[PDB]
Symmetry: D2
Subunit: 129 residues, 4 copies
């Protein structure tokens, strides 16, 4: 099931060319994944105290069109694959005219954050998705 | 003054090793709140740029009283406390969900022509509003 | 050939939990491409005079092991293919024990800065990196 | 007056729309220079964390006189001007390649135990380095 998250573009996100810096979109995608988890009752600050954490293992981003200061964007996010210790997020960003700006596929691994050691997905998360 | 409130969620990008918000992130938070205060009064800084009007920070003092942390929902509070000629002073504060005062700042802002970095007078539209 | 660029990890690059934030690596790779180009005298000035800019079209990043605060990293960068209007950069990050932390493949398109429309690579870029 | 100098190149990531360096990026640059001044004196904050020693910014004043721009090579200049109990004051400035003064800052830094966010005395070996 799709999760939608709005993001306003501020000065901090722009670069000298007048458009959003290509790495700023990477952060935007992370916020949307965090809010999708939050919507299903997962706080990563809370989980870290339980020695549960999620890290990016692989990421592909393809850039089609720019965003500019003051644009209101929408990040669209789905969990498309789920396995033992990892899951795949498929994401994209559109602007207020529904123009596709870019899209990403993100492989995420569940780890023990003190050992950086992969651990099985909590069955709560497997059931919730 | 007419106070303006803006909520901000703390994400991983805002945090640093050791588990508190990085000190420069607060500076960005304060800027977002000034931008949204302007938006609430019908001003767009992308729009004003084509009109050769922009705002730059000239001086800033920040007090860090207590840390924010990952997943905190914060409130930025913003007032314009002084205006004259080309510049204005914002007084801003940050509180958390307990109403703990985490941070406060005083920001001197100068209106400039962006293609030249010259100070120019605050345009009458702005000063009329605030 | 191979171009090497050192990068020190600072607090701004780290996140809560004590590792480098994943988007920080993306900026590190961009610095190394910029410095690779500079090493061949393709400074920003030189690119502007050639009426070219470079934009990232597609990028894949593999995160094998974390960098941490105070690590001195080495970014290794090579142009692995060059065709028409685009370049592919292959890049890797190792730490001071030569542990492979990260690698990336970056498709970069040559654009004119007016419409940001694709344009053929400058003959000097082609001549230098063939 | 044992000044420490640190060079910084301005990259795209540091700039904002309009073509100047974003005002918060200077704050990061000053932090890098303090960290390198500590490193030159043989201290690592990652290592100090393991000993429950950390440094946090308590107050900062920044003055923006003139902008840095893409690809400028800057020099950050840093001195410790006060050192007392749990805290130090850093005085810093940024010049560009023509020695134009772009920026000045004063930063009050407090030593804390990072697990309790509670101030503690400066490590004796750090006090010895900068006295
Ligand atoms: C971490 C501190 C806690 C706080 C979290 C901070 C949150 C902030 C968010 C970020 O910015 S994360 C920072 C950037 N990312 C990193 O630093 C991660 C660095 N990578 C690692 O440390 C290791 O790669 C990792 C611990 C994630 C995995 O180690 P391994 O090499 O032992 O993984 P392994 O080979 O055992 O396989 C793990 C899973 O990935 C799958 N996998 C690995 N490579 C794959 C691939 N290339 N394609 C498809 N699947 C792949 C693999 O099959 C398996 O799936 P399953 O067990 O569910 O079947
Ligand atoms: C820390 C983990 C590893 C290090 C990471 C370094 C990252 C890189 C550098 C940074 O980015 S630092 C992040 C930004 N700075 C901060 O988060 C510092 C936040 N400030 C504090 O936690 C305290 O002010 C500090 C421990 C430094 C000093 O506490 P004190 O009480 O000893 O000093 P002070 O007298 O100056 O405190 C002023 C006011 O803050 C109040 N306060 C202090 N800590 C508080 C607290 N934890 N919660 C609520 N209020 C607090 C304090 O009681 C007092 O209130 P009143 O004036 O009304 O009496
Ligand atoms: C095009 C940008 C559009 C907006 C995009 C940014 C929005 C996002 C928010 C930010 O991140 S703002 C970026 C950080 N802030 C700055 O870069 C502001 C830099 N400051 C200046 O360019 C000038 O100080 C300013 C135009 C604001 C005022 O110039 P003034 O000379 O009329 O005022 P002032 O007397 O306060 O300037 C103090 C000293 O700086 C000197 N100065 C100013 N501009 C200079 C310059 N360009 N080159 C060398 N010196 C300069 C000025 O002459 C004077 O030197 P002296 O008192 O020692 O004689």
């Amino acid at each position: 099931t799709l999760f939608r998250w709005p993001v306003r573009v501020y000065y901090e996100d722009t670069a000298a060319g007048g458009v959003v810096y290509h790495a700023s979109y990477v952060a935007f995608y992370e916020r949307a994944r965090t809010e999708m988890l939050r919507h299903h009752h997962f706080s990563q600050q809370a989980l870290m105290a339980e020695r549960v954490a999620f890290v990016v293992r692989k990421m592909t981003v393809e850039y089609y069109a720019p965003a500019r200061l003051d644009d209101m964007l929408e990040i669209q996010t789905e969990i498309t694959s789920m396995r033992g210790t990892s899951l795949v997020f498929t994401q994209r960003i559109v602007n207020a005219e529904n123009t596709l700006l870019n899209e990403a596929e993100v492989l995420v691994v569940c780890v023990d954050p003190l050992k950086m050691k992969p651990r099985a997905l909590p069955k709560s998360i497997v059931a919730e998705f």
